[PDB]
Amino acid sequence: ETVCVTGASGFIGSWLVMRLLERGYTVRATVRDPTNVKKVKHLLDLPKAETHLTLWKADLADEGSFDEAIKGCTGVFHVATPMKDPENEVIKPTIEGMLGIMKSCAAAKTVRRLVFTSSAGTVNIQEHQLPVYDESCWSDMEFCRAKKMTAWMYFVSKTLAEQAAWKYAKENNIDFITIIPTLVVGPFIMSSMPPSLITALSPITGNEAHYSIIRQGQFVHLDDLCNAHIYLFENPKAEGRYICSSHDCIILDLAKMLREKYPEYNIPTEFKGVDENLKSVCFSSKKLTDLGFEFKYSLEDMFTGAVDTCRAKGLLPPSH
């Protein structure tokens, strides 16, 4: 059958296409710029890309642009998201894009299910942290707007887009699933540095401005995540939002896993404002596992796959 994947040039999108191709789907991968060799080379190099992968130019800002790509699809995987005035440059596009792709799905008449990649930023952005988050939990928009932490506009954009999308999904018998990853970490097929690896390997690179997100962190392996995407597309019992997250630990525990694996790097021992009495916040993937889905990887796997791919590509120095 034929499935569309938006944001195929990205870290999650390209890995998902790979997996969908390996499982024997015919894939329509969407990109904003098909002439960009540094993004399409990696797509066109995937197994079965010659016979089962087609490329489609589309942009979330352009109303109707996903129309033709989606027409004749049985499934859509909406992974793409827009990345000075955030309210209009990021927020509105994301919501409109989202609706735009369900409109395009309905216009298509052939889509049986739409799977949206959401964000942990839709779940736990509030001032007080619960010890365990689940799918009934939603982020606090007034806290986002009033405090404006790093990435606030992506918290707000994805929360609003997913809620706007659920409205539409119930209205129009559009059968909609959402998957909520926490920090996605793993090897990758792209030659640019995955954004979430800038955050995950921050203990190594010393990028302080990324610590807050891993102070109390949650993690999922890219391959577990893509599988979860396909599983949920297929498994017709699937309903609702699904958290996809395999590990949680505070930054001390992360950094401590890393030091032991990577003596080679200058991985600090203590972090500002972080007691060992800091509780870890877990994202419960019970709803997903109760369906039957199983996680195949470990925190160690994630960061090994990551650091190995990053050095191989010259994105990380081999030591400090």
Ligand X SMILES: O=c1c(O)c(-c2cc(O)c(O)c(O)c2)oc2cc(O)cc(O)c12
Tell the smallest beta-carbon distance from residue 275 to ligand NAP (Å): 26
CA dihedral 231, 237, 248, 5 (to 10 degrees): 40
Using CB under 6 A as the binding rule, whether residue 95 contacts ligand X is answered as no
Token look-up 């007080």 returns 128
Q: Is 184 assigned to a binding site?
A: yes
Using CB under 6 A as the binding rule, whether residue 117 contacts ligand X is answered as no
Using CB under 6 A as the binding rule, whether residue 161 contacts ligand NAP is answered as no
Active-site hit among 158, 256, 279, 286 = 158
Using CB under 6 A as the binding rule, whether residue 100 contacts ligand NAP is answered as no
Q: Is 95 assigned to a binding site?
A: no
From residue 37 to residue 66, what is the string marking binding to ligand NAP with x (rule CB under 6 A)? Answer: --x-------------------xxx-----
DSSP 234-288: H-TT--SEEEE--EEEEHHHHHHHHHHH-TTS---S--TT--TTPPP-EE--HHH
* Stretch of 78-86, 160-168, 281-289, 306-314 contacting ligand NAP, by CB under 6 A: 78-86
Binding partner of residue 203 among ligand X, ligand NAP, none, CB under 5 to 8 Å per kind? none
Can you tell me the distance from the alpha carbon of 227 to that of 215, in angstroms, rounded to the nearest whole number? 27
* Stretch of 9-17, 140-148, 227-235, 295-303 contacting ligand NAP, by CB under 6 A: 9-17
Token look-up 């995955």 returns 194
Instruction: Give 89's DSSP letter.
Output: I
Binding partner of residue 9 among ligand NAP, ligand X, none, CB under 5 to 8 Å per kind? ligand NAP
Using CB under 6 A as the binding rule, whether residue 178 contacts ligand X is answered as no
Binding partner of residue 71 among ligand NAP, ligand X, none, CB under 5 to 8 Å per kind? none
| Closest by Cα among 66, 75, 14, 73 to 39 | 14
- Tell me the β-bridge partners of 290: none
- Tell me the β-bridge partners of 12: none
The SS3 call for residue 109 is coil
Using CB under 6 A as the binding rule, whether residue 79 contacts ligand NAP is answered as yes
- Interacting residues of 317 by C-beta distance below 8 A, sequence separation 6+: 311
188 vs 11, 20, 191, 273, 307, CA distance in Å? 6, 15, 8, 32, 10
Can you tell me the distance from the alpha carbon of 216 to that of 210, in angstroms, rounded to the nearest whole number? 12
Using CB under 6 A as the binding rule, whether residue 233 contacts ligand X is answered as no
- Window 173-192: residues binding ligand NAP (CB under 6 A): 181, 183-184
The H or E element that residue 181 is part of is strand 176-181
Binding partner of residue 32 among ligand X, ligand NAP, none, CB under 5 to 8 Å per kind? ligand NAP
Question: Of residues 100, 187, 194, 203, which one binds ligand NAP by CB under 6 A?
Answer: 194
Token look-up 């938006």 returns 6
Q: How many CB atoms lie within 10 A of CB 110?
A: 13
Q: Is 81 assigned to a binding site?
A: yes
Tell the smallest beta-carbon distance from residue 170 to ligand NAP (Å): 22
158 catalytically annotated: yes
Binding partner of residue 151 among ligand NAP, ligand X, none, CB under 5 to 8 Å per kind? ligand X
The residue number with the shortest CB distance to ligand X is 121
Can you tell me the distance from the alpha carbon of 297 to that of 91, in angstroms, rounded to the nearest whole number? 33
State CA 205 to chain mean position distance: 22
Q: Which is closer to ligand X, CB of 20 or CB of 125?
A: 125
Residue ranges for the known binding site for NADP(+) are: 9, 11-12, 32, 39, 59-60, 79, 81, 158, 184, 196
For the annotated catalytic residues, the residue numbers are: 158
Residue ranges for the known binding site are: 9, 11-12, 32, 39, 59-60, 79, 81, 158, 184, 196
